[PDB]
Coordinates of C-alpha atoms and ligand atoms in Angstrom, one line a residue:
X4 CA 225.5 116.4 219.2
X5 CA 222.9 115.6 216.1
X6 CA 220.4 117.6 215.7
X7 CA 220.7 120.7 213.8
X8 CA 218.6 124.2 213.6
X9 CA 218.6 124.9 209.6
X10 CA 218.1 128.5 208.3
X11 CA 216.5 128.9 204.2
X12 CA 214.9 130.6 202.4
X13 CA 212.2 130.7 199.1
X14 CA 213.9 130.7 195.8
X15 CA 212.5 128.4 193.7
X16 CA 214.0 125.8 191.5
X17 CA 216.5 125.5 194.6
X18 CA 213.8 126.2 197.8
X19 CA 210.5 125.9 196.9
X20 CA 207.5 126.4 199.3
X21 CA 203.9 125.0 199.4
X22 CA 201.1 124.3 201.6
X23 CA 200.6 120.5 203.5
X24 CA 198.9 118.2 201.5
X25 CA 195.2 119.4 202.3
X26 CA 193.9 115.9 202.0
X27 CA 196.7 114.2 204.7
X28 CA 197.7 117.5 206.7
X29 CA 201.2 116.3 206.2
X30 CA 204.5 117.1 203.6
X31 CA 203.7 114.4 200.8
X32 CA 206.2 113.2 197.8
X33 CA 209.5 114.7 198.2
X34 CA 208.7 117.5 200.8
X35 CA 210.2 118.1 204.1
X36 CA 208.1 120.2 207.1
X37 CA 209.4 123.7 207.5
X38 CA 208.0 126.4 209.7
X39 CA 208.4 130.3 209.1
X40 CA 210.7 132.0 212.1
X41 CA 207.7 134.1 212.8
X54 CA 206.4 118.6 211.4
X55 CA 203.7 120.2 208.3
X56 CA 202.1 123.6 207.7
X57 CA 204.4 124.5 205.1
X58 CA 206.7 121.9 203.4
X59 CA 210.0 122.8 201.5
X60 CA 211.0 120.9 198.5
X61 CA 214.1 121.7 195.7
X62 CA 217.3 121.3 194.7
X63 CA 219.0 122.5 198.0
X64 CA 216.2 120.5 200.0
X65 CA 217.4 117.5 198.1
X66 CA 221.0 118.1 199.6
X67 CA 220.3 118.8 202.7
X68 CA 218.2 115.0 202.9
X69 CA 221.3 113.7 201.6
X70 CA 223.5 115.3 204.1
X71 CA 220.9 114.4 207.0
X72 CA 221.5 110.8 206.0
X73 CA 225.1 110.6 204.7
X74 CA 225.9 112.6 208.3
X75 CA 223.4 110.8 210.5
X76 CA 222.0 114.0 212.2
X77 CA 218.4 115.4 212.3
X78 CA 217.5 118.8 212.1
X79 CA 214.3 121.3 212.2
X80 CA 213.9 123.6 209.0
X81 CA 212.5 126.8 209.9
X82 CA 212.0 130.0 206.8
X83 CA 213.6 133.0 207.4
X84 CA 211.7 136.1 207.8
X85 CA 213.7 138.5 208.8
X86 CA 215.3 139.9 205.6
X87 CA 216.3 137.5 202.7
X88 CA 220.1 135.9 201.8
X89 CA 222.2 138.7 204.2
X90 CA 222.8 142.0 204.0
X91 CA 224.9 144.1 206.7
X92 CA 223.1 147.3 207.4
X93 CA 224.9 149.9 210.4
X94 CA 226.5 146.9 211.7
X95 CA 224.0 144.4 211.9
X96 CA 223.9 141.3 209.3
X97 CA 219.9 140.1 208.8
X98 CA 218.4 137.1 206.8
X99 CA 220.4 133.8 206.2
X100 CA 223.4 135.1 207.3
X101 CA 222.4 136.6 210.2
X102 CA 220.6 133.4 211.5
X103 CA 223.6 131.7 211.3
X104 CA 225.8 134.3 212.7
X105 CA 224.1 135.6 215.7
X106 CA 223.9 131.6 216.1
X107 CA 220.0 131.3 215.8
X108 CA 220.7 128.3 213.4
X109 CA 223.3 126.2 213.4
X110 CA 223.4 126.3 209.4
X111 CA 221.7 128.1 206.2
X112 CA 220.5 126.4 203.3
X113 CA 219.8 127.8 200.3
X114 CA 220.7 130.1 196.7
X115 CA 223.4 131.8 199.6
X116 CA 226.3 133.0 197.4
X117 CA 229.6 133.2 198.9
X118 CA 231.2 136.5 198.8
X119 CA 234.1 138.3 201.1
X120 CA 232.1 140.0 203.1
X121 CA 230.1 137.1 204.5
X122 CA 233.1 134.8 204.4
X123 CA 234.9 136.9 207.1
X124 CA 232.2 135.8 209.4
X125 CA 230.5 132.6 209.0
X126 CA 232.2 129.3 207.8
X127 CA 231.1 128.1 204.4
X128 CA 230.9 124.9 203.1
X129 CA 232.6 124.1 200.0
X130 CA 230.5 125.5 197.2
X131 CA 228.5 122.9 195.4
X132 CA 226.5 124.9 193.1
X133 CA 228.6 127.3 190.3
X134 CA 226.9 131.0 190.2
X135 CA 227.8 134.7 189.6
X136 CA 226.0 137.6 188.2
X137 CA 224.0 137.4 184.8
X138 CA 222.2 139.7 182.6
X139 CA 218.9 138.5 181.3
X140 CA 217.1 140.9 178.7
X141 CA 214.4 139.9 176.6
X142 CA 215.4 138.2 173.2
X163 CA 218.0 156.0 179.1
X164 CA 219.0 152.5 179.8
X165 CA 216.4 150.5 182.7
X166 CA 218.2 148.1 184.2
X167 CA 217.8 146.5 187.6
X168 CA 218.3 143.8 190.7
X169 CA 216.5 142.4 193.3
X170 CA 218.8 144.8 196.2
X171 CA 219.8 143.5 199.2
X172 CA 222.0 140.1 198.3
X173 CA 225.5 139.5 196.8
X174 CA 225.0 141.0 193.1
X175 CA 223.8 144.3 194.9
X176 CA 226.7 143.9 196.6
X177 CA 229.1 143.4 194.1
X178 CA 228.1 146.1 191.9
X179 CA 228.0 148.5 194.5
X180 CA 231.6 148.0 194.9
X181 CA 232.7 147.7 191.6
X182 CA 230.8 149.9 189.6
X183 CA 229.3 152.5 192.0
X184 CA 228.5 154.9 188.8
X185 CA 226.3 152.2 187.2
X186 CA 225.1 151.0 190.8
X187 CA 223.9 154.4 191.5
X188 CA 221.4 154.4 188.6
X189 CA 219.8 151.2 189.0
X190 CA 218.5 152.3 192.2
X191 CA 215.4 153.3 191.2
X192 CA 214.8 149.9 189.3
X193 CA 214.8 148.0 192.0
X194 CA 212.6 145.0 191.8
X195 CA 211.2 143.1 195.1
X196 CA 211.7 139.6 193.8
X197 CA 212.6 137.7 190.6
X198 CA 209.0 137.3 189.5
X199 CA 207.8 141.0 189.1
X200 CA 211.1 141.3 187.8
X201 CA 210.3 138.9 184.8
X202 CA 206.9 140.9 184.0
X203 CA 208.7 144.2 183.9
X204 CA 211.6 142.9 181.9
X205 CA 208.1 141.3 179.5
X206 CA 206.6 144.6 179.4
X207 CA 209.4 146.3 178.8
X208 CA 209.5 148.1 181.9
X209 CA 213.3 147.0 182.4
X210 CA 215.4 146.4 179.7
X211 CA 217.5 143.9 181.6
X212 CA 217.2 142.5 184.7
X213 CA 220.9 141.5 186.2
X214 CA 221.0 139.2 188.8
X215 CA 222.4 135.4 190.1
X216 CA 223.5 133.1 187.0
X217 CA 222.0 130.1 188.8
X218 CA 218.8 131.5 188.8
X219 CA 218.6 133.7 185.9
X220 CA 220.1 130.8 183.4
X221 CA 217.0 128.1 184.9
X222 CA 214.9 131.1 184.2
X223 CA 215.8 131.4 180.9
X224 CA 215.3 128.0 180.3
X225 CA 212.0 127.6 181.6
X226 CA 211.0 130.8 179.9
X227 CA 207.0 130.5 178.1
X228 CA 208.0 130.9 174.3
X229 CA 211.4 130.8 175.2
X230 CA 211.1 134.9 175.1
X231 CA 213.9 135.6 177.7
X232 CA 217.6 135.1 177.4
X233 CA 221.1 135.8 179.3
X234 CA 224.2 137.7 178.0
X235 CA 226.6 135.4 176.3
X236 CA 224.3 132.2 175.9
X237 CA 224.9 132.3 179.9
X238 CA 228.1 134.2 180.4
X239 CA 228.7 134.2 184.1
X240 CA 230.3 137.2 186.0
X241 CA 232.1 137.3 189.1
X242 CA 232.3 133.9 189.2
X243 CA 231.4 132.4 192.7
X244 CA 229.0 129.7 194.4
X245 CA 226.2 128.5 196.9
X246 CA 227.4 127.3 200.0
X247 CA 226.0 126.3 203.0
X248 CA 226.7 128.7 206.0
X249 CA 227.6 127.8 209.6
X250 CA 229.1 129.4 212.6
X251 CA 232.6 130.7 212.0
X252 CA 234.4 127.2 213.0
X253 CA 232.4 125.2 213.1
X254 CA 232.7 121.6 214.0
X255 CA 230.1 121.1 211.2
X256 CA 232.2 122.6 208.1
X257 CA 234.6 119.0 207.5
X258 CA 231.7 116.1 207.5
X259 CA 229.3 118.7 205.9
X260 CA 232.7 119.0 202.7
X261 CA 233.4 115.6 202.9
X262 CA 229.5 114.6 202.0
X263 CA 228.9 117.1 199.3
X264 CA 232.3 115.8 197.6
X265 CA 231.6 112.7 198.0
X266 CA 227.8 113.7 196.5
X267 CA 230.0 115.5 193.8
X268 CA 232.2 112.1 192.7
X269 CA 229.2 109.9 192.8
X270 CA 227.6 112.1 190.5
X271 CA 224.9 112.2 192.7
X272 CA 224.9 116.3 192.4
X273 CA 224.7 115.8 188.1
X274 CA 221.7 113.9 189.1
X275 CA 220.3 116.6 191.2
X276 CA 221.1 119.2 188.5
X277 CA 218.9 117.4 185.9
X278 CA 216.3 116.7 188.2
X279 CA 215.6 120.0 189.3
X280 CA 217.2 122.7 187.2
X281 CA 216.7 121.3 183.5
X282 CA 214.6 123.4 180.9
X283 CA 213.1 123.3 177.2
X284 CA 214.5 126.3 176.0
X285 CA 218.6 127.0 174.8
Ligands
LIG1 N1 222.2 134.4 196.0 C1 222.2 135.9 196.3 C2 220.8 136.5 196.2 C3 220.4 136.9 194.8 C4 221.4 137.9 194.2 O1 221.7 138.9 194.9 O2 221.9 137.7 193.1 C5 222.7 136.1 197.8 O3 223.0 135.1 198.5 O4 222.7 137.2 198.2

């Protein structure tokens, strides 16, 4: 009746994963405890961690924060949905937490929240064609039902997280790196000289959102929407924004 089971994920500035304070052995500053699906150990901190504290409160429920490790955001694969997604809909967790974008597919069957970060695809290059995603979540997803031709060659750039992809669009090794606005635009803005940039001064694609997943009807979905617009009108989420998602360069 009040306590939850939250799914998330890594994705740093919005999940953000580090040790226990090795001094105290517990989750110091603003860091909550949050164990892998394999109180301390590893603590989770970051934009989405923020809400989810709010929504704890605003709510009055408590919850356990676990990482998942099988897969990432979702992907549905012969029938069987893994990482965030999954969690939620083979009901392992009663809600995920994270960068999840909302997209058809996924919205068929779990119940999202109403979207409180805007995101889409961007294309970040540095200020044949070698262009590339991390595969597996929603920008995969969308290209590879909108534009199968150009999906079809940027298979074999496939990059296994947003870091290496970074270094390889540095070096050159990919001359642009497509991937969620959210992330790619705080990127770019926290980018060491400033070197990397997004199409359009930030032009967002296929306009979508994060939202928070949770069984298809849930009872959760209405006081979870109420919250974050409420968060929303108190400009509590503005806050949020500057707090963890501002940069030096633009
Ligand atoms: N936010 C995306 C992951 C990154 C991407 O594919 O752009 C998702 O939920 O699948």
């Amino acid at each position: 009746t009040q306590h939850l089971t939250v799914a998330t994920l890594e994705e740093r500035p919005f999940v953000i994963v580090e040790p226990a304070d090795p001094i105290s052995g517990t989750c110091i500053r603003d860091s909550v405890p949050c164990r892998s699906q394999l109180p301390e150990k590893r603590c989770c901190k970051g934009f989405c961690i923020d809400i989810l504290k709010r929504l704890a409160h605003t709510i009055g429920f408590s919850y356990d924060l676990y990482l998942v490790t099988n897969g990432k955001h979702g992907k549905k694969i012969d029938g069987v949905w893994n990482g965030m997604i999954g969690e939620v809909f083979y009901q392992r967790a009663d809600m995920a937490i994270g960068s999840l974008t909302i997209n058809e597919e996924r919205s068929e069957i779990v119940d999202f929240s109403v979207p409180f970060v805007e995101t889409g695809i961007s294309v970040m290059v540095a200020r044949p064609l070698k262009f590339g995603t991390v595969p597996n979540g929603s920008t995969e997803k969308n290209i590879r039902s909108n534009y199968p031709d150009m999906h079809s060659y940027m298979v074999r750039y496939n990059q296994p997280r947003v870091e290496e992809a970074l270094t390889q669009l540095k070096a050159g090794k990919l001359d642009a790196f497509i991937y969620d606005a959210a992330v790619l635009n705080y990127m770019a803005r926290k980018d060491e000289g400033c070197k990397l940039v997004t199409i359009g001064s930030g032009k967002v694609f296929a306009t979508t959102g994060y939202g928070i997943a949770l069984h298809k009807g849930s009872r959760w979905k209405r006081p979870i929407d109420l919250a974050l617009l409420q968060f929303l009108g108190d400009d509590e989420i503005e806050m949020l924004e500057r707090l963890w998602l501002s940069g030096i360069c633009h």
